[PDB]
Amino acid sequence: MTTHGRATHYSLGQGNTIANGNCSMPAVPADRMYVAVSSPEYSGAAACGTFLDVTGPKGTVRVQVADQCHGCEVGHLDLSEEAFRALGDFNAGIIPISYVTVRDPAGPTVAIRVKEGSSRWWAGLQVLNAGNRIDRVEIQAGRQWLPLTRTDYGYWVTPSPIQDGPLTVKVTDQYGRAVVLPGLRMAPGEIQRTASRFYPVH
Amino acid sequence: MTTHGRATHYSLGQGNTIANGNCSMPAVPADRMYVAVSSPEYSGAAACGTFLDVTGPKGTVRVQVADQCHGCEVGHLDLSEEAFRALGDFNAGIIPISYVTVRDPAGPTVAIRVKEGSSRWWAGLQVLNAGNRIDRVEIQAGRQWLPLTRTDYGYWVTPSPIQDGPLTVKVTDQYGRAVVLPGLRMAPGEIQRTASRFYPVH
Ligand SMILES: OC[C@H]1O[C@@H](O[C@H]2[C@H](O)[C@@H](O)[C@H](O[C@H]3[C@H](O)[C@@H](O)[C@H](O[C@H]4[C@H](O)[C@@H](O)[C@H](O[C@H]5[C@H](O)[C@@H](O)[C@H](O)O[C@@H]5CO)O[C@@H]4CO)O[C@@H]3CO)O[C@@H]2CO)[C@H](O)[C@@H](O)[C@@H]1O
Numbered sequence: 001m002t003t004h005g006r007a008t009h010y011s012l013g014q015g016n017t018i019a020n021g022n023c024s025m026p027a028v029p030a031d032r033m034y035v036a037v038s039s040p041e042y043s044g045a046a047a048c049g050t051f052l053d054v055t056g057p058k059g060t061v062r063v064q065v066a067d068q069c070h071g072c073e074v075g076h077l078d079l080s081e082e083a084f085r086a087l088g089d090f091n092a093g094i095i096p097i098s099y100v101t102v103r104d105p106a107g108p109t110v111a112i113r114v115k116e117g118s119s120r121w122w123a124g125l126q127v128l129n130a131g132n133r134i135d136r137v138e139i140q141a142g143r144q145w146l147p148l149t150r151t152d153y154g155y156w157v158t159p160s161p162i163q164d165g166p167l168t169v170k171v172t173d174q175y176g177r178a179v180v181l182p183g184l185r186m187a188p189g190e191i192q193r194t195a196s197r198f199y200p201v202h
Numbered sequence: 203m204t205t206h207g208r209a210t211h212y213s214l215g216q217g218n219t220i221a222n223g224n225c226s227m228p229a230v231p232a233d234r235m236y237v238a239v240s241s242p243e244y245s246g247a248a249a250c251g252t253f254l255d256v257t258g259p260k261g262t263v264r265v266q267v268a269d270q271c272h273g274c275e276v277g278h279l280d281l282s283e284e285a286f287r288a289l290g291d292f293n294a295g296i297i298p299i300s301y302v303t304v305r306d307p308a309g310p311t312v313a314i315r316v317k318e319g320s321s322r323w324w325a326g327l328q329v330l331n332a333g334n335r336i337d338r339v340e341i342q343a344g345r346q347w348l349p350l351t352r353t354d355y356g357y358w359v360t361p362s363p364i365q366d367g368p369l370t371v372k373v374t375d376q377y378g379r380a381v382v383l384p385g386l387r388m389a390p391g392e393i394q395r396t397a398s399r400f401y402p403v404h
Contacts, residue, residue, distance in 0.1 A: 010323050016390060018220055018318045116220040121212050188218060 005075025007056065007097045009084035010036065012067065018116065018189075021067030023048035023154035024126065026113060026191060029064050032082035036067035038074045046133050048154045051102040054079070056087030056095050062102065068152075105131045110179055110196045112169065115155055118188045120164045124155035128191065131198060133174040140168035173198050206300045207277025209258065211286035212238065214269065220318065223269030225250035225356040226328065228315060228393055231266050234284035238269030240276045248335050250356045253304040256281070258289030258297050264304065270354075306401045307333045312381055313395045314371060317357055320390045322366050326357035330393065333400060335376040342370035375400050 012020050015028035021036065023045060028034065035054070041047055047065045054061055054077065061083055069078040077097065081090070088095035107129045115124030125148065127134055137156040138145035141163070148156035167184040179196040214222055217230035223238065225247060230236065237256070243249055249267045256263055256279065263285055271280040279299065283292070290297035310331045317326030327350060329336055339358040340347035343365060350358035369386040381398035 011321065012319065013321050016318045018391075020319055116218045117214070117222055117226075119213065119215050189220075 002098050002100050003075050004098045005077065005096075006094055007054070007077045007079045007084060007087065008072075008094050009081050009090070010069075010078050011081050019153075022152070023066050023068075025064075025066055025154070026126075026128070029066070032080050033061060033063045033086075034066035034080045035063040035083065036069035036072065036078035037065055038072040038076060039068060039070055040074050042068040042152075043133075044150060045152045045154050046150065049128070049130055050133060051105045051131075052077070052099045053102055054083070054087065054097055054099040056097045057089075058087050061086045062105070103132065104199045106202070107131050110171070110181070110194050110198070112181060112184055112192045112194065114184075114186060114188045114190065114192075115157075116188045118186065120186065121161050122158050123162065123186070124151070124157045125169065126155045127171050130171065130173055134171055135174050135176075136170075136172040138170045138172075140170070145170055204300050204302050205277050207275075207279070207298075209256070209279045209281045209286060209289065209297050209299045210274075210295060211283050211292070212280050213283050221355075224354070225268050225270075227266075227268050227356070228328075228330070231268070234282050235263060235265045235288075236268040236282045237265040237285065238271035238274070238280040239267055240274040240278060241270060241272055242276050244270040244354075245335075246352060247354045247356050248352065249303075251330065251332055251336075252334060253307045254279070254301045255304055256285070256289065256299050256301040258299045259291075260289050263288045264307070305334065308404065309333055311396055312373065312383065312398045312400070313393050314383060314386055315393050316386075316388060316390050317359075318390045320388065322388070323363045324360055325364065325388070326353070326359045327371065328357050329373050332373065332375055336373055337376050337378075338372075338374040340372045340374075342372070347372055 012028050020028045050065045052063050063083050072078055111128035113126040137148045149159055151157055168182045169184055170178055170180050172178040177198045181194050214230050222230045252267045254265050265285050313330040315328040339350045351361055353359055370384045371386055372380055372382050374380045379400045383396045
């Protein structure tokens, strides 16, 4: 459904390679098109990684959900300065908008980043380029799949110690589509590439 | 007073420059002497940075509180492998210990690290080398002091956007001693070492 509301602007700045915004993105988007959303819409970070098509006075742009705006009511987006300028007059401070969450946004293959400080005792995993909301992230333990816990900062974490070796992870999106990612290394901070996608390229 | 209990062992491993343990230390101590403590002893990260003098079968060693052991009861320490080996037989798995928190531990001057991703809209500060528990961290805002919020991960964070310009931060410890740190820079990731100490060197 389309949400009708308003936008203000802010900036994460140029950022870093560790954690940008409440979603802890590996980078600020190169095009600087990102948005912080209300706490309900952030949904305990379940909205992290998703995209919104936002229409304002000047037209329509796409922004990555990057962050949480605690003071934004539902329907109020805190856009990047760049996204704001593309849609309206910067000095207006606030502009009327309408927006939708993009289904299957065009994107690269799924990637995985292990959190700094992770080990066999405790680890966080971040799922990059899923495109849509992720419902479950599980690590193989023999015949079973052990569920990781969704944090409110864009990672999924181990409830209990895991093995001292290669990791197989299954990620299931909100539409029930799953990818299985084998051979993942306990390599904190590194973005590990895969060949896997939730949906074909168009 | 003195706590009597038990120790097990675990490892943070080699570590990184971003966040080590739940206290998010800038580094695993060079001497690998650290400990994860029970949730009540962790006290919402208030124990972060403090030291324990731990007595076991082989003698006494000092460990830095670096981490939280959710599964530990009060009196149960999860020591680094190195600290464990210093106190007892590694393969025993569990050793009897007694311990106390060190008052005014010998150490360097106070340092401040601004969290990666910080800006004027939102920032986190980490206070390093206070030695004892910190009770308050405030940022100067004219004639007022704005209170930062203690997170459970070793930082203190802004409740609201702050002014621009040089930061002046006041840190007050559990004994009511305050240090004032002027000229601090919005420099995410950098350890900013200051001239201040809560107590003289001995
Ligand atoms: O068994 C425990 C286990 O702990 C390990 O240590 C972990 C700890 O478990 C994790 O919880 C902890 O997680 C923190 C991340 O490291 C940290 O980067 C992340 O930072 C967030 C912050 O939480 C969030 O509030 C902040 O929000 C702001 C946005 O950034 C701004 O842009 C916006 O304007 O305002 C919002 C606030 O309104 O975002 C930052 C990220 O950018 O917080 C996580 C905790 O909540 O990490 C520890 C280290 O990995 C320990 O290592 C294990 O040994 C131990 O077993």
